[PDB]
Ligand binder design. Sequence first.
Ligand code: HEM
Ligand SMILES: COc1ccc(C(N)=O)cc1
Ligand SMILES: COc1ccc(C(N)=O)cc1
Ligand SMILES: COc1ccc(C(N)=O)cc1
Ligand SMILES: [Cl-]
Length: 393
Amino acid sequence: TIPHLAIDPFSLDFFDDPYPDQQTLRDAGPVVYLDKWNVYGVARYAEVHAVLNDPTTFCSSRGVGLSDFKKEKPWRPPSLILEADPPAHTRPRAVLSKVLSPATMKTIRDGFAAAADAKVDELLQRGCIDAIADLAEAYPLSVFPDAMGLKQEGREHLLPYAGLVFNAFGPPNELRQTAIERSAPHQAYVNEQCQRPNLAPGGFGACIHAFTDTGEITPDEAPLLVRSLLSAGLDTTVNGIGAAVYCLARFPGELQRLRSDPTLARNAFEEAVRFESPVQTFFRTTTREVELGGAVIGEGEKVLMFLGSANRDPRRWSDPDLYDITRKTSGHVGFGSGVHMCVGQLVARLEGEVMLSALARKVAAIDIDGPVKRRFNNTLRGLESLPVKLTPA
Ligand code: HEM
Ligand SMILES: COc1ccc(C(N)=O)cc1
Ligand SMILES: COc1ccc(C(N)=O)cc1
Ligand SMILES: COc1ccc(C(N)=O)cc1
Ligand SMILES: [Cl-]
């Protein structure tokens, strides 16, 4: 039998303090039912991990938002990659995997690192900064659109476009309906930038389009794949980096360990992703009767996965509520898991690593001094403002 809960995981109150409610989602049972949205959810590591890794039973092509694409109209033309199942998922996934490969990362690494080092130097001259606007936002804006091959004009649409995209996975609450209603200028900007002539040579965009020349993808598929990176590639990392800086500020001891060993940079970042989980929730839809958490769920049912909760499940993590930069982070579901596991994870880890490496080397202390402000999103967790004083090494 399946416990009914009145928790609204897409409400402002939940966003503002999700942890007691997430403990309840986990502790009530391995499978729950949410009265407010009439859907099943699993919040424990074991179930979330199991669902991610059985795409046959828990498919994505019926949407990874609440909306069931088999019965409803998608808010936009579906992603070729995020919202598709094997075998169809395979080819577009292969393309983005090549474009965002370890080898590609070697070619851009030095530029990313110098940008990060320069960015921290610049902030140190001011002292009083906003770790969101001046760092978590500024840094990825300075490297990712260039690495994409994007024109300078119209970049201000990138953040709110991703905000839109992630709200749209949500239920039809105010956050979602207001996003979609204000969407047209963002979409129109994005659609211009997805076209072959507008993407600089040597960038992610052009590289994607090159796959049309070999017959690997069509001229129609090409722009939709660029759309994927512009949908998913920025706001996530912004929140990842913001999360890392927030953790180092709240856990001063962990910052000092990072200064003592800056090679901990990449793992400090991974641990921030586990701890805050910029992407909080995704859905799947059952393709058959299936037993999950000891309950039988019927075919065609949406299932809500609490990734951020799974990453804090005491059944899997010791002292889950502590930021520990030497934790074995392997296994966390912040980037998902299985066939859909984040295809841009190397890009994100590169941005986060080089940026925490710069902080590790150049900063002695990070102190919160001012009102902290949260940004609300149906899917993304992160801060709108984080005033900090940086003290130079
Ligand atoms: C901290 C940063 C990031 C986080 C937390 C994150 C999170 C995730 C998660 C949880 C998934 C799984 C989706 C699912 O299972 O349905 C995913 C997939 C994906 N991510 Fe990321 N991501 C990040 C950075 C990036 C970057 C930098 C890019 C592109 C440059 C990117 C592009 C994608 C794409 C295209 C997919 C779809 C993969 C597929 O369906 O095969 N993400 N991401
Ligand atoms: C699958 O193709 C489409 C195309 C457009 C839309 C839309 N604009 O909502 C939804 C689905
Ligand atoms: C246009 O296609 C896509 C693909 C992936 C994503 C994402 N992970 O948010 C968003 C949009
Ligand atoms: C997470 O979603 C968003 C939305 C808008 C902005 C912004 N306007 O800077 C930043 C992030
Ligand atoms: Cl769009």
